[PDB]
Design an enzyme around this catalytic site. Structure first.
Site, PDB file in Angstrom:
ATOM      1  N   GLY A   1       0.806  -1.230   0.000  1.00 42.68           N
ATOM      2  CA  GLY A   1       0.000   0.000   0.000  1.00 42.68           C
ATOM      3  C   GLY A   1       0.829   1.265   0.000  1.00 42.68           C
ATOM      4  O   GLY A   1       1.966   1.236  -0.454  1.00 42.68           O
TER       5      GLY A   1
ATOM      6  N   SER B   1       4.910  -5.056  -2.298  1.00 42.88           N
ATOM      7  CA  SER B   1       5.197  -3.630  -2.142  1.00 42.88           C
ATOM      8  C   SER B   1       5.700  -3.301  -0.738  1.00 42.88           C
ATOM      9  O   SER B   1       6.651  -3.903  -0.238  1.00 42.88           O
ATOM     10  CB  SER B   1       3.953  -2.800  -2.420  1.00 42.88           C
ATOM     11  OG  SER B   1       4.025  -2.265  -3.724  1.00 42.88           O
ATOM     12  N   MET B   2       5.029  -2.366  -0.085  1.00 48.13           N
ATOM     13  CA  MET B   2       5.454  -1.933   1.232  1.00 48.13           C
ATOM     14  C   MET B   2       5.472  -3.063   2.260  1.00 48.13           C
ATOM     15  O   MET B   2       6.116  -2.948   3.293  1.00 48.13           O
ATOM     16  CB  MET B   2       4.585  -0.757   1.698  1.00 48.13           C
ATOM     17  CG  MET B   2       4.926   0.548   0.984  1.00 48.13           C
ATOM     18  SD  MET B   2       6.696   0.989   1.064  1.00 48.13           S
ATOM     19  CE  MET B   2       7.012   1.015   2.856  1.00 48.13           C
TER      20      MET B   2
ATOM     21  N   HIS C   1       7.202  -4.364  -6.335  1.00 50.27           N
ATOM     22  CA  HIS C   1       6.210  -3.685  -7.133  1.00 50.27           C
ATOM     23  C   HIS C   1       6.484  -2.185  -7.149  1.00 50.27           C
ATOM     24  O   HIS C   1       6.556  -1.540  -6.086  1.00 50.27           O
ATOM     25  CB  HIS C   1       4.803  -4.012  -6.600  1.00 50.27           C
ATOM     26  CG  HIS C   1       3.706  -3.237  -7.263  1.00 50.27           C
ATOM     27  ND1 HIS C   1       3.468  -3.294  -8.627  1.00 50.27           N
ATOM     28  CD2 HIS C   1       2.783  -2.383  -6.752  1.00 50.27           C
ATOM     29  CE1 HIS C   1       2.442  -2.510  -8.924  1.00 50.27           C
ATOM     30  NE2 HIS C   1       2.009  -1.948  -7.804  1.00 50.27           N
TER      31      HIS C   1
ATOM     32  N   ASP D   1       7.855  -6.126 -11.929  1.00 52.74           N
ATOM     33  CA  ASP D   1       6.952  -6.745 -10.946  1.00 52.74           C
ATOM     34  C   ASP D   1       7.408  -8.124 -10.494  1.00 52.74           C
ATOM     35  O   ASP D   1       6.591  -8.972 -10.199  1.00 52.74           O
ATOM     36  CB  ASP D   1       5.516  -6.831 -11.486  1.00 52.74           C
ATOM     37  CG  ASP D   1       4.712  -5.549 -11.258  1.00 52.74           C
ATOM     38  OD1 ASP D   1       4.792  -4.948 -10.169  1.00 52.74           O
ATOM     39  OD2 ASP D   1       3.968  -5.148 -12.177  1.00 52.74           O
TER      40      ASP D   1
END
Lengths: 171, 171, 171, 171, 171, 171, 171, 171, 171, 171, 171
Positions: free
Chosen positions: B55, B84-85, B109, B149
């Site tokens: 996020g 991601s995060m 990502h 990705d």
């Protein structure tokens, strides 16, 4: 609740959050918290963690007054974002005890019938005054910077005077 | 509640979850939890279990800062998915104490007006920098891999450097 | 709450439910539960009761990993329906301690952008592999039976190898 | 809550209610209750009070299974109405300890894609089988009576074999 | 909840809030609180913090009556805004113990079938009478100032006689 | 909830509120309160505080009957407004222990198929009868005054006989 | 509407759309349209444009029956997607007048108590029969291809026999 | 409607809008419009005005097919924004009759289970192919530019080949 | 509708309204209207009445392009308020035919991820350019004035050059 | 619709209504109506019927401007109530053609951040100016009367100069 | 719509309804209707059918004024109920042409800050005056009867003077 449960426990640790929009409701609740903590022990510090887009001036001003009122020091921590009144409250912490987390960032922002105008003018001027005082800068710069919506890095914020320290580890 | 009751009990065991989208609300709540735990006992470890699609960068960045702030070690566990995060926070655990469960998988990502661009560019670069540092890789590879990705198996994740161990049994 | 109150009390009895769709939210909660229980006492068994239409593979796989992670045995009980990932988790219980209630029934079911396909293919193959291993059957049969949406009676389920016992009375 | 508070207290007395439509959610909750009580003390009786229009067969069959599973006796009380699966559950109590209150009344009722048909047929047949067994009657009569939606008075219900006693005073 | 939890704790510190519109519901609740506090200990002070746009006269008058009724002193704090009935109640605190926070501001305001007019006239005249008395000013000035919606700074409010002190630090 | 918490605590002080419209729901709840208190201690007084626009006759009459039923005295306090059945209940306090606060005001008011008319006529006449008795006035005046919607000042209310004392300080 | 206005105008041109899920409501409306058009002129063609994910067999089958019923030819156009019953209806157009647009694609798909099973079996077998007949293929291949969810390119669809022409320009 | 009324009138002028997200519903409606207009007069031009963020490939591809199908020319106008499939459709206009308004801008964008992947891959490749053809560029550049999310000014768009003219005045 | 009926009739008089927020939807509709009118008669004027708070730049820029596109003159009328893009469109009217009604007032206003920044910077600069051009002022003043949120009287607006005439009576 | 149908028909008779709160929406709609009618025939009168509590100054001022703009006379009818801006617009009708119905009544009323104050002051002063001019009175009286909320009878309104005639019968 | 369609058609027959609460909105609509009809033909009668509980005085008074204004006769029909302002309007019909249907009934009723009281008193007195005049009774009786909420039968209403005829058949 869990969220509430956590904040409650954290309130027993003299730790307090401004984690959203500074509106009257939240203001009241923060003020309430500060008062409670001061009443419980007037000598120990209070820690206020800020991650807030700011909000209503008078609402924020109420919080400030209560901070001032409370006999004990109020430590301030920019965690994430301190914008508008969120910046102000960050800046308003007891000198020496104002902190920014490394990736925190500070945003200054020009904030927010005939009768309401007078009141607003008076309170806006008063905010600029105090922000200048907290910060070590001229009122002219505080205004100009707020018009241009100037933002700051933790490093940049330490230099401008919003904050006394950038923390990496605690203790 | 049952759900909250479980997480609460689990918090008494210094065990914490990132179990969804990293937004400001959840970030605030996690930071709150880390703060509480650190305040309760600054020497004992904190265990953070991650099964999150990641996020917002700055939200995740706030969490990271708090992890760093907390005097105590933060053990990290990829349980399901760290993207991601979510990957970043997995990677940011105390070195030596970063774990992946056998079928966990890690996704890098490429994450997420004029003033918000500036801010984002600064914080995006800063994330890549730290991801590179956590991970032992060049910033160039961290970027290239994020664009394509690239995903990782628990085994592949251990090799790339996101994680120190793949656990089967605990103890 | 009453419902939550019952499940909480039941959790103090090391008894746990998978009573609906296996999604991320529920997965997280179950993992949380297993972790808590294992942390409270690493030697006593955990009882997992299953009446679930299954759901997301990776969510289910996260639960599985946590089951494996937990040092203690996990007894498994098909109560009503164990389908898709619900079947899988039934099958994944500690060998010897997998139960079906007499009228329980087990359903195999072929489960559930370019990047997501890769991940899915990898994790689906891996599920089939483990289902085969849990069950004593060839991967070929596991696949074929999933495609034809084969279901099983408690008796039939015991034969196929999903379960070790059909229970009438407890003790 | 008051309502929950009452049922909770009543659960501490090993007293339990089926007081509405037998759906999966309620079924799960009753099964939960039966398990909890059995876990708390495997030797003391459980009292199940029935005032229910019945409902889903498999849901009801799950409850039955759990009744069977619980080592302890399950005393059954028709209080108001036991219809369809509510009748079944009444009839399924431990023999000797099935009761009807004087104005209670029992309703038999023929209950409730290609794959679901198979399953239903199998479980419907199985319910008839067990109702006949609980009740001492031929499967043929159990079926014929269900088609004609035959109802019973507490007196008629005692004769047919749904219940062992009609209670006036307790002790 | 958290909000309620804070106010409850704060009530254990004999601290109380008028933080919104003075309507009957809120009035009842404040009166309730004053009564409780007085009943718990008739000798210790009560602190009433005011940040209220005021509201219904008779509602406010009921609070006033309850303040007078309570044997103990009632310390009054303008925190943010005290307007109309909010001002009145600020002014009505035990003389010597009326405070304004530095940026608080006080607003006087001309407030709000045949039968209701009588009642209103009687109670409005009575309010002006008491405001004049609390404040040291002539009734004529109280009226004139209310018509022109005159507002006051903390400083100006101390001069006019709404308040005995302007606080910076507490103790 | 804070509001509920306050009323609960206040209930432990044998203090009770009629603070809105007298409808069946609230009536039941007050009766409940009176019964509880009477059951807890039949000798200590109950204090009922009234700030109510009144409401349904029969609802109010139920409260009355419960007051009468309770062995202990019921002290009555007009706090703000006692109108219609609110007045009635004020007046129905134990003689000697009926109070008005200085700015409280009392309103008499002519209150609120073929079968319901009969019932209403009977209960309306009965109310007038008792109001006359509580109050020392002729039934004729009670009626006439109710038609003309006559209201009363605390002083006027003491004269007419609704109330035994006007209180300033308590003790 | 505009949308409706367009379809209406288009209906005056004997042009008709299956543009979504084949449910009963839509089925009814298409049958209605076919009937109207046939009633208006039994000799002129009707054009049916298909871009549908298919839907309920019996709903689809009703449309088919109506197509057959209408004396006039029904030209069929795969525009975008014809899947399940959408494919069936495409294939069901008057032989010689079945078209696919170049990027159109056709999906075969194995479609969708005891009494409903019977009915579905009968109608499913009947659909396979007709699909085979429309298409020139053996029933065995129609089945096998539906199980494997086989899809087709406009070119591949022309070969398999779902369609008579691939159109580029009209006229 | 007014809005619908305007588009309807405009439709009588053979003028048509793609003014939002390209989803199935809108695609259907545009196709419908193109078909209607072509049916009304196969010789006159159609004007398609594009201010769209693009959307679903297959939806857009259906529109394209219908454009090709319609015997008459389709003039294309980038008014505001033509992105993704919006760009594609802009580019797909009859050569010679593709326009951009001076401040229009064009965005290329890499667009949007196992079975769906195959389909998507086939249709994505096919889009690139046609974009390349419409545009005069190599497939390699069409891809590379889509990945880097390259945007274009009306001038830059004319050069790259999306558009034949930049219009200032009409006629 | 009545409201729509009015605007429709008024559209037959080549009269058009910008009467709210300039968003994409309204922009589309205006552009649609200008196109229709131009198509109906390329020689007669269009009257555009503005009472709008402005809105999205690109939305407004689309409208502008369409005005320029339309062969016919576009007369512009500030009726009430022309702010932000509302001001721009007022200023963009055919030179000689720009009007303000006597009490109309004009507001200039500094308007409204990395990729969107670029686009916005480009289109913002372009707006300033054209605003300067329309108005006869230096780009520097257009910017300075927008930052300070400068507003104008009909008289002041005529001087600054937003408008050619202040109308009292029409003809 | 009926309501709309009536107003439409009435619009064909050059008859128009201001029948509620003067807000921007309604203002726009009235201005639209005036423009339409003016455009349809610049020589025939327009009749404006006023039964409105008034509302926003600038909204009202927009309507005024459009009245003046319209070449044709605007006859004004006070029908029920003309207050604030309603009064203003009544008074603004073509001199000679301002009417009040016998029981109509006229209310003057002192109407309704730093930047909006300026604007309001300018437009309020301007309103007073024109009301004075419409009405034949001194600006001083217009102000004084607006502060005291002075109302008028049809007779009194004719005298003060809001209106030229009181009508009984029409013709 | 049908309802509106009926009223519209009926409006073409100079037939009009007051069929609910007399509020401003409905009043406006009725006045509109009366104006329309009078404008269409000033010589033919208008029929107004009343079945209304009455409502706001001034709203009703506006309707009255419009009735008087319209050159043509207004025939009045009590159909069901004419109460308060509904009675007034019934009574206000052209003398000779006031009807009650046999079971209609008429209710008189005493109807419905400092500034609003004046206005109300003036308009209430004025209503009584006119009711007296319409009705042939003394103002004293009109008042006394309104206070006692006197109702009337069609026969009693004819006698009192509300109405000129009781109709059985029309013609």
């Amino acid at each position: 609740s869990l969220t509430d449960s956590v904040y409650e426990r954290l309130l027993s640790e003299r730790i307090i959050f401004l984690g959203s929009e500074v509106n009257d409701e939240i203001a009241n609740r923060l003020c309430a918290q500060i008062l409670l903590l001061a009443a419980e022990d007037a000598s120990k510090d209070i820690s206020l963690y800020i991650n807030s887009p700011g909000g209503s001036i008078s609402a924020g001003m109420a919080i400030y007054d209560t901070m001032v009122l409370a006999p004990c020091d109020i430590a301030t921590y920019a965690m994430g974002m301190a914008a508008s009144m969120g910046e102000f409250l960050l800046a308003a912490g007891t000198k020496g005890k104002r902190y920014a987390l490394p990736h925190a960032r500070i945003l200054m922002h020009q904030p927010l019938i005939a009768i309401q105008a007078e009141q607003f003018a008076v309170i806006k001027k008063e905010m600029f005054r105090l922000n200048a005082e907290f910060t070590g800068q001229p009122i002219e710069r505080i205004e100009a910077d707020s018009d241009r919506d100037r933002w700051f890095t933790a490093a940049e914020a330490l230099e401008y005077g919003f904050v006394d320290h950038i923390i990496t580890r605690a203790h």
